[PDB]
């Protein structure tokens, strides 16, 4: 792990949707992609591995965590073979591609395996505030890197895998230059509806409105990765449907629709999913994004928000307890402003793992406050 220290000290190179698109449409030179990836992938792995090493020992010890580490090590080492192998050889080029397939395969279970690890750790050592926020910090970073890893690999395999019959032939790798947002909204709805009907025997209807301020009558389109947007929508629709159907299961009123407003401004594409599922007290809003606080695993909301933040967007939730909840996905309207947001291992990151509890900054009441009556 001298090679890991060194790679972990390198800074990652965040790419924009624009760049992925410009590269795939106008360039699409395999050499170039190889020279980039043979280096960028070990940099990204090493940045993460260094952070997994900083985890509390009780968590580091879990077989699931140790298994993830060794998958990452195996991948890192396999990619490092390519540091001194010339692109000017169509032979190297082809093996490198196979290597990408292999590491993508090896990494397929990373998310559930890691989750397993922290579940093992929570159930065996109890839930602790300062450690909790630490794990949160870690998982956000670790899962975002995993997402970016799969992004890079998919672009290269989709572009150079030499596939005769591409599933989405007008796309650039996994990027749809004309992604119709409402269509992805309807598809995500339908697939949630299906799972909700299966178990509850009923599901609210979707209503979709659009407002394209950019140009008021045109269908809203964005340059984006449709599978990412799909994942986000599906997760929110599923939450909205569950809450709606659970609330009205003993009422006579009839189920309110789940509403979607899609809007496009100079900078933002925004998607608001509103339900009348009764809402959630403010005190619990932030826990909904905790992995370890947590029919139909408490990962849907944190992972969804990682997909949104990954290209400089965000995912926010706002409730009125007693009535309902708005969930808003914000994406960048412009591909030139949609840069990867990648965790960098440095001293700032290290400090987050090395911080011990501090006194609260702000006051806290007694759990048994003095009775002011007498």
């Amino acid at each position: 792990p001298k090679q890991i220290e060194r790679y972990s000290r390198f800074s990652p190179s965040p790419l924009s949707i624009k760049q992925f698109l410009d590269f795939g449409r106008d360039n699409a030179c395999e050499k170039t992609s190889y020279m980039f990836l043979r280096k960028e992938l070990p940099v990204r792995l090493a940045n993460t591995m260094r952070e997994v090493n900083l985890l509390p020992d009780n968590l580091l010890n879990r077989p699931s965590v140790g298994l993830v580490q060794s998958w990452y090590m195996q991948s890192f080492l396999e990619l490092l073979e390519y540091e001194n192998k010339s692109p000017e050889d169509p032979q190297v080029l082809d093996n490198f591609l196979q290597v990408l397939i292999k590491v993508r395969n090896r990494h397929n279970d990373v998310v559930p395996t890691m989750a397993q690890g922290v579940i093992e750790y929570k159930e065996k050592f109890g839930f602790d505030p300062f450690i909790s926020t630490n794990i949160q910090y870690f998982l956000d970073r670790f899962y975002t890197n995993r997402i970016s890893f799969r992004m890079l690999i998919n672009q290269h395999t989709l572009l150079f895998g030499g596939d005769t019959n591409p599933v989405h032939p007008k796309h650039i790798g996994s990027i749809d230059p004309t992604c119709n947002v409402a269509d992805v909204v309807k598809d995500a709805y339908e697939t949630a509806k299906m799972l909700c009907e299966q178990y509850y025997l009923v599901a609210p209807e979707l209503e979709v409105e659009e407002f394209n301020a950019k140009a008021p009558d045109k269908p809203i389109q964005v340059v984006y990765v449709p599978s990412h947007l799909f994942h986000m929508l599906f997760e929110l629709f599923k939450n909205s449907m569950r809450a709606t159907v659970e609330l009205y299961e003993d009422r006579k009123e009839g189920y309110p629709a789940v509403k979607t407003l899609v809007t496009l401004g100079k900078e933002d594409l925004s998607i608001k999913i509103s339900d009348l599922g009764g809402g959630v007290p403010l005190r619990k809003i932030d826990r909904l994004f905790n992995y370890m606080y947590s029919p139909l695993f408490g990962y849907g909301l944190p992972i969804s928000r990682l997909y949104a933040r990954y290209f400089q967007g965000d995912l926010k939730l706002y409730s009125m307890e007693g009535v309902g909840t708005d969930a808003v996905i914000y994406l960048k309207a412009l591909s030139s402003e949609s840069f990867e947001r990648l965790p960098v291992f440095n001293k700032s990151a290290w400090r987050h793992y090395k911080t011990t509890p501090e006194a609260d900054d702000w006051s806290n009441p007694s759990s048994e406050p003095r009775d002011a009556s007498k």
Binding site: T356, E358, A359, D360, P365, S366, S367, E368, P369, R370
Partner: protein, 97 residues
Amino acid sequence: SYPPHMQVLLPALSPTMTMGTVQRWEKKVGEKLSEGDLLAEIETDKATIGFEVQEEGYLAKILVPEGTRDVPLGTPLCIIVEKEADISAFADYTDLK
């Protein structure tokens, strides 16, 4: 006798405070203490207070266990030593210059 050490006494942490409950220890026996680290939550009638380490060293021994109610002002709460080499001596309960 014992190596150079220091007792941490429970102060009046608020102007009306006469006693406090040791709700939670935030340091373990063995751990290094820096000035301003969080040492314990102390609960009164009036507040839950983050009690900070005022002098650096190592936690040698805990005198008042977690959950002790109504500990008076002035009671020794724990023993602090300069170097970690000295800790083992205190599993038994002035060059401190």
